[PDB]
Design an enzyme around this catalytic site. Structure first.
Site, PDB file in Angstrom:
ATOM      1  N   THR C  23       0.622  -1.068   0.368  1.00 16.87           N
ATOM      2  CA  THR C  23      -0.401  -0.343  -0.086  1.00 16.87           C
ATOM      3  C   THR C  23       1.118   1.388  -0.186  1.00 16.87           C
ATOM      4  O   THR C  23       0.846   2.343  -0.563  1.00 16.87           O
ATOM      5  CB  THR C  23      -0.773  -0.213   1.053  1.00 16.87           C
ATOM      6  OG1 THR C  23      -1.537  -1.656   1.626  1.00 16.87           O
ATOM      7  CG2 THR C  23      -1.619   0.995   0.802  1.00 16.87           C
ATOM      8  N   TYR C  24       2.145   0.937   0.965  1.00 14.96           N
ATOM      9  CA  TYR C  24       2.884   2.555   0.434  1.00 14.96           C
ATOM     10  C   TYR C  24       4.253   2.482  -0.796  1.00 14.96           C
ATOM     11  O   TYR C  24       4.494   3.155  -0.631  1.00 14.96           O
ATOM     12  CB  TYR C  24       3.296   2.616   2.026  1.00 14.96           C
ATOM     13  CG  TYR C  24       3.855   1.544   2.778  1.00 14.96           C
ATOM     14  CD1 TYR C  24       5.206   0.904   3.008  1.00 14.96           C
ATOM     15  CD2 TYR C  24       3.251   0.531   3.754  1.00 14.96           C
ATOM     16  CE1 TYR C  24       5.292  -0.206   3.180  1.00 14.96           C
ATOM     17  CE2 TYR C  24       3.411  -0.003   4.925  1.00 14.96           C
ATOM     18  CZ  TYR C  24       4.536  -0.555   4.622  1.00 14.96           C
ATOM     19  OH  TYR C  24       5.221  -1.806   5.385  1.00 14.96           O
ATOM     20  N   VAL C  27       6.652  -4.423  -2.899  1.00 16.32           N
ATOM     21  CA  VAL C  27       6.924  -5.642  -2.004  1.00 16.32           C
ATOM     22  C   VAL C  27       7.620  -5.940  -2.702  1.00 16.32           C
ATOM     23  O   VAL C  27       7.530  -6.618  -3.753  1.00 16.32           O
ATOM     24  CB  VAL C  27       6.573  -6.263  -1.367  1.00 16.32           C
ATOM     25  CG1 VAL C  27       7.058  -6.699  -0.100  1.00 16.32           C
ATOM     26  CG2 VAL C  27       5.413  -5.428  -0.862  1.00 16.32           C
ATOM     27  N   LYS C  42      10.369  -4.516   1.798  1.00 14.61           N
ATOM     28  CA  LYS C  42       8.920  -3.555   1.516  1.00 14.61           C
ATOM     29  C   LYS C  42       9.503  -1.926   1.265  1.00 14.61           C
ATOM     30  O   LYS C  42      10.345  -1.607   2.720  1.00 14.61           O
ATOM     31  CB  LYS C  42       7.973  -3.513   2.647  1.00 14.61           C
ATOM     32  CG  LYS C  42       7.403  -4.893   2.982  1.00 14.61           C
ATOM     33  CD  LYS C  42       6.330  -5.058   3.776  1.00 14.61           C
ATOM     34  CE  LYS C  42       5.287  -4.725   3.593  1.00 14.61           C
ATOM     35  NZ  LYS C  42       3.959  -4.853   3.955  1.00 14.61           N
ATOM     36  N   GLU C 100      11.022 -12.000   6.811  1.00 10.76           N
ATOM     37  CA  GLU C 100      11.235 -13.216   5.260  1.00 10.76           C
ATOM     38  C   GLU C 100      10.313 -13.418   4.912  1.00 10.76           C
ATOM     39  O   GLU C 100       9.024 -12.607   4.819  1.00 10.76           O
ATOM     40  CB  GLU C 100      10.756 -14.008   7.361  1.00 10.76           C
ATOM     41  CG  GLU C 100      11.722 -15.298   6.892  1.00 10.76           C
ATOM     42  CD  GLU C 100      10.321 -16.151   7.447  1.00 10.76           C
ATOM     43  OE1 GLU C 100      10.099 -15.992   8.883  1.00 10.76           O
ATOM     44  OE2 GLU C 100      10.609 -17.535   7.074  1.00 10.76           O
ATOM     45  N   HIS C 104       4.193 -18.571   0.253  1.00 11.37           N
ATOM     46  CA  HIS C 104       2.794 -18.489  -0.460  1.00 11.37           C
ATOM     47  C   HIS C 104       2.119 -17.596   0.776  1.00 11.37           C
ATOM     48  O   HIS C 104       2.461 -16.879   1.834  1.00 11.37           O
ATOM     49  CB  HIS C 104       1.759 -19.379  -0.456  1.00 11.37           C
ATOM     50  CG  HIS C 104       2.591 -20.986  -0.898  1.00 11.37           C
ATOM     51  ND1 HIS C 104       2.162 -20.757  -2.572  1.00 11.37           N
ATOM     52  CD2 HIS C 104       3.541 -22.071  -0.591  1.00 11.37           C
ATOM     53  CE1 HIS C 104       3.122 -21.477  -2.639  1.00 11.37           C
ATOM     54  NE2 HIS C 104       3.449 -22.376  -2.079  1.00 11.37           N
ATOM     55  N   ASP C 105       1.212 -16.762   0.063  1.00 12.85           N
ATOM     56  CA  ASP C 105       0.070 -15.992   1.203  1.00 12.85           C
ATOM     57  C   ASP C 105      -1.315 -16.888   0.683  1.00 12.85           C
ATOM     58  O   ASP C 105      -1.488 -17.667  -0.771  1.00 12.85           O
ATOM     59  CB  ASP C 105      -0.342 -14.977   0.584  1.00 12.85           C
ATOM     60  CG  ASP C 105      -0.531 -14.385  -1.270  1.00 12.85           C
ATOM     61  OD1 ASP C 105      -0.191 -14.894  -1.500  1.00 12.85           O
ATOM     62  OD2 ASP C 105      -2.153 -14.538  -1.251  1.00 12.85           O
ATOM     63  N   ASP C 145      -7.301  -4.588  10.021  1.00 11.21           N
ATOM     64  CA  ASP C 145      -6.901  -5.483   8.557  1.00 11.21           C
ATOM     65  C   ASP C 145      -6.615  -7.372   7.918  1.00 11.21           C
ATOM     66  O   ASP C 145      -6.065  -7.121   7.176  1.00 11.21           O
ATOM     67  CB  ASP C 145      -6.297  -4.230   7.325  1.00 11.21           C
ATOM     68  CG  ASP C 145      -7.033  -4.511   5.984  1.00 11.21           C
ATOM     69  OD1 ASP C 145      -7.752  -4.785   5.965  1.00 11.21           O
ATOM     70  OD2 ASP C 145      -5.241  -4.358   5.622  1.00 11.21           O
TER      71      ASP C 145
HETATM   72  C1  LIG Z   1       0.640 -11.565  -2.044  1.00 12.74           C
HETATM   73  C2  LIG Z   1       0.234 -10.802  -1.167  1.00 12.74           C
HETATM   74  C3  LIG Z   1       0.598 -10.415   0.144  1.00 12.74           C
HETATM   75  C4  LIG Z   1       0.711  -9.219   1.146  1.00 12.74           C
HETATM   76  O1  LIG Z   1       0.894  -9.639   2.758  1.00 12.74           O
HETATM   77  N1  LIG Z   1       2.612 -10.470   0.083  1.00 12.74           N
HETATM   78  C5  LIG Z   1       3.553 -11.074   0.017  1.00 12.74           C
HETATM   79  N2  LIG Z   1       3.863 -12.434  -0.400  1.00 12.74           N
HETATM   80  C6  LIG Z   1       4.944 -12.511   0.591  1.00 12.74           C
HETATM   81  N3  LIG Z   1       4.780 -13.813  -0.277  1.00 12.74           N
HETATM   82  C7  LIG Z   1       4.181 -15.220  -0.737  1.00 12.74           C
HETATM   83  C8  LIG Z   1       4.757 -14.838  -2.299  1.00 12.74           C
HETATM   84  C9  LIG Z   1       5.546 -15.593  -3.116  1.00 12.74           C
HETATM   85  C10 LIG Z   1       5.240 -15.375  -4.168  1.00 12.74           C
HETATM   86  C11 LIG Z   1       5.003 -14.230  -5.439  1.00 12.74           C
HETATM   87  O2  LIG Z   1       5.363 -14.552  -5.901  1.00 12.74           O
HETATM   88  C12 LIG Z   1       4.555 -13.606  -7.293  1.00 12.74           C
HETATM   89  C13 LIG Z   1       5.657 -13.661  -8.421  1.00 12.74           C
HETATM   90  O3  LIG Z   1       6.580 -14.530  -8.773  1.00 12.74           O
HETATM   91  C14 LIG Z   1       4.148 -13.847  -3.947  1.00 12.74           C
HETATM   92  C15 LIG Z   1       3.914 -13.475  -3.010  1.00 12.74           C
HETATM   93  C16 LIG Z   1       5.816 -12.655   1.604  1.00 12.74           C
HETATM   94  N4  LIG Z   1       6.882 -12.149   2.376  1.00 12.74           N
HETATM   95  C17 LIG Z   1       6.803 -11.736   3.473  1.00 12.74           C
HETATM   96  N5  LIG Z   1       6.131 -10.173   2.767  1.00 12.74           N
HETATM   97  C18 LIG Z   1       5.323  -9.675   3.402  1.00 12.74           C
HETATM   98  C19 LIG Z   1       5.530  -9.986   5.578  1.00 12.74           C
HETATM   99  C20 LIG Z   1       7.033  -8.742   3.775  1.00 12.74           C
HETATM  100  C21 LIG Z   1       5.415 -11.062   2.540  1.00 12.74           C
HETATM  101  N6  LIG Z   1       4.361 -10.310   1.175  1.00 12.74           N
END
Ligand SMILES: CC[C@H](CO)Nc1nc(NCc2ccc(OCCO)cc2)c2ncn(C(C)C)c2n1
Lengths: 826, 248, 325
Positions: C23-24, C27, C42, C100, C104-105, C145
């Site tokens: 949002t800000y 990443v 971030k 770290e 996945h999410d 959130d």
């Molecule tokens: C995707 C929404 C979240 C919001 O939070 N996004 C995120 N996804 C992290 N990993 C999962 C990931 C792994 C690979 C990927 O691939 C894209 C193209 O290859 C996309 C997403 C993650 N790990 C730490 N953080 C924050 C706390 C610093 C993260 N935030």
């Protein structure tokens, strides 16, 4: 925004279901064949089938059953779409005019529910009192068939057994009764319930639960003379009815899984059974009549009749004629004889219905130098595997090359006047410790052959135990002549090595044209492959010679030639290799921001990467620096099945939910973040599973073709044999055609009264969005089939835009010309 | 993990300001003025007392790493308050802080903000965050003065007088480097100790252990009396130097 | 030392790619050059200079350096772009917040349809989330959130709560004016739909209950585009807001304004009959209209469903395999 046009060049050919009954008239016996979104109606004759009517529904046909409630002269048709659109249909004919009546309709989707593993199941009561639907785990939905239920309103009954395998309504019960096999931690069981429309709940069933085979697959409802049910498994067939229990376990059925059943004799004496190897069996119910005057089931016996195509649905017609509905291979009409032939078979093929089967891969190649272009497709699976050469000539001409093994990838090499085809065949662990093929096939019938001697993985030290009877895949590279389509050479890859990717190209300064194959070492223990080979072959003078090998730490899912370099995707990594003067591959640059780089496409120095779960990423090769740069990604999560580049800015994708989307660069340089965001501008529910996108067109080009409004040409193949075409439009042409669709949808009557806009809406279990950026060309091309009154009604108050005349009124004759030009792109 | 934000009194002879030729009295005056400026500006804006203290603590810590001759105090103060507002969820727009700062500062003083006051302040935020090592969470003597007072049982009027007098001492300690010498918990005890001496109250009687003459050892462990006296002496010195007297 | 944040340069990380847009700022996934540990970076851009350093990032920095829990994302450090020498005013480079990398999410796994959740898998998931929420709620911080996208999952089965951009402290004694419209509509509690403005920590519980049902159905429970439509969907399942079940509902600003079509009865147990009984009881309590009657995080941990779950047996979920391609 982006504007695109999608039409069907070949309708779905795979048979998804088939039933027999008295639908068109209470007198004639009709065969209703269901292909994805297409319903075909036939009338049974002594020679074969007489086609009568074909309708398309705005939905994927999941349930299809014929029923005749008391008071009706003839059978009615129930259909339920995968989007949960239900309807009851009636055939009505007035002289030469044939139309399909929608008697009842509605959407039976629940707000909260878990879709079941074994899919939608639909059954109808023998007394046609209710329709049973198994849509969600733990719930049984009942649509009562009362005269007043024109909206198909329904209620749910709580079902304790969460994991149901199959369910059927039973015959000979005092109340509507369901018999079903379910699975819980203690194994699989058979159980019965009674359905009370008055109480709207289950009551105790007529007979007790019985423990059944762990792989009990299908429930057969036996008719009134016997009663009860038959349960088909992998190794055993069982009959259940209160106190009676019979079980037959012939060794023949153990060899191949039985997938389809049908009743030959209305009294239930004889049933037909089919298995994945195509064997057709007759299941016999041996009767014993007691002095009491009652009839009981004495024993069960299974007898092999012969071999047919691998059949999704079987239906006995009349005499000895059986329709073999095949999803993996061509469908058939076969006659069952009382006397076996000299080979011991009772089955003789009558007719063969072309099924393009699963189109795993395909390429467009001009074999005759006409500029017309021909489509060679990898079609079918297992024994039904085939290469299909398709040309336009008004129908499509299709030639079939039988392979008898599964084709995987195809690529054309003009220098060698031949095709390279990856294939896999099933062998079984045998008493020798090796494996034996169930039948000869393309890889075993090649003129010359070769087997890999690579020692890369020879050190092993990883134990992989083998049990007799287990199946294994054996992968090969086939060299096939472009004129005779004869297998010239076959190269067998290493044990447990899968061939995943294939290209034909020149590299670097090397003048030789090579076949290059990317493989993965597949062991059952591994979740993701951790070993792989990139192999360079040269086909010269009837022999295939291995030029070089490159060891990789993963599966080479996709490869593509990139300006004299080899672009390969190994698991998460996307890599670019150079071809040295020493004829060895040399790594140059890598990209790692992927989960699984399944698909690759290139235009210029741009690369489109398709991910298992992260949609698409636009990569770029930066020659000044010798490395990759991330241009733009689609952050919305999609499961990709195939991708394609439309132009430098628009990118096409296919989802595993049968949807198509178009991503574009946001073309806004204000912020770098905007450029890095790929905005999905096109959303469209195709209804088919797309495996291969391929640039090209089958239409003959004489250089004289009136330049069509559509620009560009992408063909795609699907799992159900459907071949489609995607092309771009100008903003003016899109708006004109889109406005026309909205007018056509008000005029055209849909089967089941299914809203067209809903059918084409993007749909995942989680999301539903309205379609955007796509013109349903199949809807546009239907303008030429509607009656003249309807045509004029459509064109009323229609204005042109951005043309030679800013605003112009359209006439019905003007549009007839426009649509006719659009029909000339395929 | 977390940084150390406390120094010894002897170390204050070696701040950047001292080593650039500023004498101890002047740096003390510069700190009293910057703190009183942050306090007055935020008070005019109606800011919570924690927000004022947080800005002051940022301010005091800042000039342990920089010299007053290179960073104007009133700009630094305004920047500290601006950030404090966001940290403590009592945000203010930078333009409003400048507006208030101009109202309270004469023409010479406001000259520190240069030709563009907002820009000078907003630019400084980068240095402030890096200087305070992004350790934004700060505890203040106020919470402990109340937490410990709540455990005292006795005459409401006698105690409430203790709290307010101690509360005044806390506000006054913000103009000193005590924030840089002793954790807030000790400060809260020290001000309770001071108010007790001045009001001739024996706090132990209100504690759960009435024979524990060391009444603070049940709130803050390992605090010698010498520490509390050192703190009291410094607070009382501020009153002796000024014309103001003990609140009593 | 390890504590002197804001000085180390981003040069120390090799940038792998952009994993999402925050949002800000955007990443990025990066690899530490020195240790080889994968991180998520971030980016916080102050170049806008409208209000300086974004408060959303300030909240995350302030809170996440206080919170240490297995189920809460850890901020490792803060690093900066190569800054201008002697010209602090000229420098417009942005700082990057280090975390770290999580494999996945949950939104990505659920959206692809590739993930399959068994009962035991859901137990391990929910227990970690509620333990993290309990730790946060005990520290008197509200996430505000809670969404499937903000639940990151490692392939090991570890769950961590992640976006603390809207998180703020809750004072039980002092009610304070708060941001009414905080949670995303699909996971927003009924009280905020009616605009309490002084919300309890139970707002986060309601969201996590919505996730509990979504793990069983594989589809979000309440999907709507308009605040009133959401109240209608919630009302059909949980029952219409009424004084009998929510005595103080009449005090909420929009109670008279925002009415459902009918006074629906509660049907949660009927529509979720397929859910196991132990879990269904948890859903009923978590999805309680009255925030004062809605269960707490600690109470959820002390439920038949989650009390006897042993965190040692993480039981990793059935994550996408090669066969699924
Ligand atoms: C995707 C929404 C979240 C919001 O939070 N996004 C995120 N996804 C992290 N990993 C999962 C990931 C792994 C690979 C990927 O691939 C894209 C193209 O290859 C996309 C997403 C993650 N790990 C730490 N953080 C924050 C706390 C610093 C993260 N935030």
């Amino acid at each position: 925004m982006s504007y695109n046009y999608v039409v069907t060049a070949q309708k779905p050919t795979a048979v998804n279901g088939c039933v027999t009954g008295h639908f068109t008239s209470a007198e004639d016996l009709n065969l209703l064949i269901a292909k994805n979104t297409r319903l075909e109606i036939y009338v049974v004759t002594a020679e074969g089938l007489r086609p009568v009517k074909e309708v398309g529904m705005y939905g994927k046909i999941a349930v299809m059953e014929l029923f005749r409630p008391k008071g009706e002269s003839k059978d009615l048709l129930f259909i339920l779409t995968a989007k949960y659109n239900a309807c009851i249909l009636e055939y009505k004919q007035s002289g030469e005019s044939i139309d399909i009546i929608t008697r009842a309709h509605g959407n039976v989707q629940d707000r909260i529910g878990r879709p079941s593993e074994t899919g939608i199941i639909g059954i109808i009561d023998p007394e046609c009192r209710m329709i049973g639907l198994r849509l969600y785990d733990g719930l049984f939905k009942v649509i009562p068939l009362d005269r007043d239920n024109k909206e198909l309103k329904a209620f749910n009954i709580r079902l304790e057994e969460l994991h149901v395998i199959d369910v059927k309504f039973l015959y000979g019960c005092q109340a509507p009764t369901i018999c079903f096999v379910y699975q819980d931690p203690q194994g699989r069981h058979v159980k019965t319930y009674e359905v009370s429309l008055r109480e709207k709940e289950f009551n105790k069933g007529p007979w007790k639960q019985e423990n059944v085979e762990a792989e009990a697959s299908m429930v057969i409802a036996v008719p009134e003379p016997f009663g009860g049910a038959i349960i088909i498994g992998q190794e055993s067939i069982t009959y259940h009815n209160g106190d009676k229990y019979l079980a037959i376990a012939p060794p023949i059925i153990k060899q191949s899984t039985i997938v389809c059943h049908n009743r030959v004799d209305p009294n239930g004496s004889r049933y037909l059974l089919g298995d994945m190897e195509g064997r057709l069996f007759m299941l016999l119910l041996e009767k014993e009549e007691q002095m009491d005057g009652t009839v009981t089931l004495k024993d069960l016996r299974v007898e092999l009749l012969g071999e047919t195509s691998i059949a999704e649905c079987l239906t006995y017609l009349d005499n000895g004629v059986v329709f073999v509905g095949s999803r993996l291979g061509d469908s058939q009409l076969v006659k069952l004889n009382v006397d076996s032939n000299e080979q011991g078979s009772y089955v003789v093929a009558m007719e063969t219905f072309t099924n393009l089967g699963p189109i795993v891969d395909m390429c467009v190649v001009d074999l005759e130098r006409q500029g017309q272009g021909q489509l060679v497709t990898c079609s079918g699976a297992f024994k039904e595997g085939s290469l299909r050469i398709i040309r336009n000539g008004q129908k499509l001409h299709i030639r079939t090359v039988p392979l008898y093994e599964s084709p995987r990838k195809i690529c054309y090499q003009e220098v060698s006047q031949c095709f390279g085809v990856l294939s896999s065949r099933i062998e079984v662990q045998d008493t020798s410790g090796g494996t034996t093929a169930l039948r000869p096939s393309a890889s075993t019938q090649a003129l010359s052959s070769s087997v890999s001697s690579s020692k890369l993985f020879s050190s092993s030290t990883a134990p992989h135990e083998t049990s007799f009877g287990e199946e294994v895949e054996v992968h090969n590279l086939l060299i096939i002549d472009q004129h005779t389509f004869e297998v010239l050479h076959a190269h067998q890859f290493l044990q447990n090595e899968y061939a995943l990717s294939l290209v034909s190209c020149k590299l670097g300064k090397d003048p030789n044209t090579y076949f290059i194959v990317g493989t993965a070492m597949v062991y059952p223990e591994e979740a993701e492959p951790k070993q792989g080979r990139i192999v360079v072959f040269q086909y010269s003078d009837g022999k295939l010679q291995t030029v070089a090998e490159k060891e990789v730490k993963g599966a080479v899912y996709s490869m593509v030639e990139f300006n004299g370099k080899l672009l390969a995707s190994i698991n998460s990594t996307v890599r670019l290799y150079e071809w040295t003067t020493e004829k060895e591959l040399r790594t140059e640059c890598n990209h790692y921001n992927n989960i699984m780089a399944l698909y690759l496409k290139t235009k210029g120095d741009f690369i489109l990467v398709g991910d298992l779960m992260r949609s698409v990423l636009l990569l770029a090769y930066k020659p000044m620096e010798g490395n990759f740069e991330e241009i733009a990604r689609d952050f919305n999560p999609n499961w990709m099945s195939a991708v394609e580049i439309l132009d430098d800015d628009n990118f096409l994708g296919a989802e595993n939910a049968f949807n198509l989307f178009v991503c574009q660069k946001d073309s806004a340089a204000t912020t770098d973040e905007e450029r890095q965001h790929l905005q999905e501008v096109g959303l469209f529910h195709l209804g088919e599973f797309v495996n291969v996108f391929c640039h090209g067109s089958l239409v003959m080009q004489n250089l004289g073709e009136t330049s069509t409004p559509t620009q560009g040409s992408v063909l795609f193949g699907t799992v159900n044999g459907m071949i489609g075409l995607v092309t771009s439009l100008s903003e003016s042409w899109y708006n004109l055609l889109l406005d026309m669709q909205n007018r056509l949808n008000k005029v055209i009557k849909s089967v089941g009264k299914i809203e067209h806009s809903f059918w084409r809406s993007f749909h995942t279990e989680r999301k539903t969005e309205p379609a955007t950026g796509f013109i349903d060309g199949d809807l546009i091309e239907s303008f030429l089939d509607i009656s003249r009154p309807k045509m004029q009604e459509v064109v009323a108050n229609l204005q042109y835009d951005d043309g030679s005349g800013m605003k112009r009124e359209a006439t019905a004759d003007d549009l007839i010309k426009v649509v006719e030009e659009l029909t000339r792109i395929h | 993990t977390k940084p150390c934000w406390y120094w010894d009194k002897k170390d204050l002879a070696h701040t950047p300001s001292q080593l650039e030729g500023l004498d101890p009295a002047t740096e003390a005056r510069y700190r009293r003025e910057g703190a009183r400026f942050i306090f007055d500006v935020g008070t005019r804006l109606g800011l919570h007392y924690d927000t004022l203290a947080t800005g002051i603590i940022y301010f005091h810590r800042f000039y342990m790493f920089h010299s007053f001759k290179q960073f104007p105090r009133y700009v630094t103060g305004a920047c500290c308050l601006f950030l404090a507002g966001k940290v403590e969820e009592t945000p203010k727009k930078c333009k409003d802080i400048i507006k208030t700062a101009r109202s309270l500062l004469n023409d010479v003083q406001f000259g520190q903000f240069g030709d563009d006051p907002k820009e000078e302040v907003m630019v400084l935020e980068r240095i402030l965050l890096q200087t305070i090592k992004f350790d934004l969470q700060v505890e203040h003597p106020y919470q402990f003065l109340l937490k410990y007072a709540k455990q005292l049982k006795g005459d409401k009027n006698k105690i409430q007088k203790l709290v307010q007098m101690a509360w005044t001492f806390v506000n006054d300690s913000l103009c000193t480097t005590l924030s840089l010498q002793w954790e807030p918990e000790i400060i809260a005890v020290a001000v309770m100790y001071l108010a007790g001496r001045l009001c001739k109250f024996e706090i132990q009687e209100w504690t759960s252990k009435p024979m524990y003459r060391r009444w603070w050892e049940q709130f803050v462990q390992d605090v010698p009396v010498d520490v509390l006296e050192d703190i009291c002496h410094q607070i009382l010195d501020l009153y002796s130097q000024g014309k103001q007297q003990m609140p009593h | 030392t390890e504590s002197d944040w804001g000085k180390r340069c981003v040069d120390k990380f090799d940038i792998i790619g952009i994993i999402g847009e925050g949002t800000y700022g955007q990443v990025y996934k990066a690899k530490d050059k020195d240790t080889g540990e994968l991180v998520a970076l971030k980016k916080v851009r102050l170049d806008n200079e409208k209000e300086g350093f974004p408060i959303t990032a300030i909240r995350e920095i302030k809170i996440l350096r206080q919170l240490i829990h297995r189920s809460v994302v850890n901020m490792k450090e803060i690093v900066t772009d190569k800054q201008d020498a002697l010209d602090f005013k000229k420098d417009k480079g942005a700082f990057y917040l280090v975390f770290e990398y999580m494999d996945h999410d949950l939104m990505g796994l659920l959206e692809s349809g590739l993930v399959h959740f068994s009962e035991d898998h859901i137990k391990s998931f929910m227990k970690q989330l509620m333990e993290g929420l309990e730790y946060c709620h005990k520290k008197n911080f509200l996430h505000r959130d809670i969404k499937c996208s903000n639940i990151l999952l490692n392939n090991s089965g570890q769950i961590k709560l992640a976006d603390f951009g809207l998180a703020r402290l809750y004072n039980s004694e002092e009610s304070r004016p708060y941001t009414n419209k905080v949670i995303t509509l699909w996971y927003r509690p009924p009280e905020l739909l009616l605009g309490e403005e002084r919300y309890t920590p139970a707002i986060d519980v309601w969201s996590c209950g919505c996730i509990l049902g979504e793990l069983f159905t594989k589809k979000p429970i309440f999907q709507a585009n308009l605040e009133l439509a959401q109240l209608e969907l919630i009302s059909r399942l949980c029952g219409s807001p009424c004084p009998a079940v929510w005595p103080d509902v009449i005090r909420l600003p929009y109670f008279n304004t925002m009415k459902p079509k009918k006074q629906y009865r509660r049907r949660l147990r009927e529509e979720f009959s397929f859910i196991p009984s132990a879990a269904l009881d948890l859903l009923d309590h978590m999805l309680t209209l009255d925030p004062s009657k809605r269960c707490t995080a600690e109470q959820t941990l002390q439920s038949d469903f989650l009390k006897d779950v042993e965190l040692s047996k993480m039981a990793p979920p059935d994550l996408p395999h090669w066969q699924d391609c």
